[PDB]
């Protein structure tokens, strides 16, 4: 009685997202649910009760705002669900399938604003895990959103790992994963957004996380026009196989970006 239920917003590798109006409030929200076709698909159904149970709640305008999880009484029975913040708008992967490349200082503005989501983040003690296109928005009002917040899983399907093109090599590994993990995917992010392909590609997941262990990232300036070595030097630092090497803060990430927007040299390594 609270929802009234609007139009299907989108869909992901396990998930189907509504349109709602909170009828108490007067908001637009944003309904998930497991994708009909697969709700009764048991790895599926396990994964989404874990995630919508372990749905991380946060206050951050660069944030998607979850306001209720829970199952829902249904005839068909109880049904797991994440209600959050309505974002009027579309993904990065949309733009980059649909737009091609954005323009270099865009592309910075984008990601500096999702630094700024991952610092909060990290602050209040949660790692993203999952960063990747699909997982940014840009609302019509060009304001950046990150959603989709990962969680901490068993230490050895279901969707979890698709292309492996954003996994960071220590998650391909099962190595200790912390902050420089998104600082990676995030560097891969970038990588995209700056070039219109991720920095590795492959015919199966397994060739994908081979080449983020074992294989240098051709610069990005050598896969598009437009592009310095500058911005070079800053996506290859936060792809930089070894965590030592790599930004230690999504902050530091955040700095250097700013400082080639502003074309001031940046602290990461110069590349030639
Ligand atoms: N808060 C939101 N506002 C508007 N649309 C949304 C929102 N959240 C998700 N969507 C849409 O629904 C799609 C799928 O949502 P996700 O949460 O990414 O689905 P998922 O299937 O659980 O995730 P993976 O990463 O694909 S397995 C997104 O790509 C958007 O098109």
Sequence with gaps: DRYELGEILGFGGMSEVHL???????????VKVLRA???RDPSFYLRFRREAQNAAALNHPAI????????????????????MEYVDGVTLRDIVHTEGPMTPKRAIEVIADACQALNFSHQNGIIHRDVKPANIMISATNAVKVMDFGIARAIATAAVIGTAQYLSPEQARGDSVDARSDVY???????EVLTGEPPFTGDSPVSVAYQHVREDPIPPSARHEGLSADLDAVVLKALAKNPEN???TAA????????????????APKVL
């Design 20 to 30: 709602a109006r909170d009828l108490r409030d007067h908001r637009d929200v944003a």
């Design 37 to 39: 076709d697969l709700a």
């Design 64 to 83: 998607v705002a979850v306001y209720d999880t829970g199952e829902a009484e249904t005839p068909a029975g109880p049904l797991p669900y994440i209600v």
């Design 185 to 191: 995917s995030l560097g891969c992010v970038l990588y």
């Design 246 to 248: 790599r930004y230690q």
């Design 252 to 267: 530091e990430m955040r700095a250097d970006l700013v400082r080639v927007h502003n074309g001031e040299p940046p602290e």
